[PDB]
Amino acid sequence: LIMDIPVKLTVELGRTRMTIKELLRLTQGSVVALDGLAGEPLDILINGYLIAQGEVVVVADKYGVRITDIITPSERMRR
């Protein structure tokens, strides 16, 4: 019944917690640090809901995600 429906998903690499003042201070060339560590597995999110975790690889001159871990909601409440 629900065999095929395209879904909208994104991959996320940063969750900086910050007030609006150092958005207001942002300009071009402005670099803000993001808590995501370089090489930490990148999390896969579908339609506003986290599912998987896994880093980034380039394939055939395209972006792609190499997934390692999936759900197990035991690691959801702390995030």
Partner: peptide, 12 residues
């Protein structure tokens, strides 16, 4: 083929 910030390319 990994991803690196060193490849800061707007590849054409």
């Amino acid at each position: 083929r990994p991803y690196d910030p060193n490849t800061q390319r707007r590849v054409v």
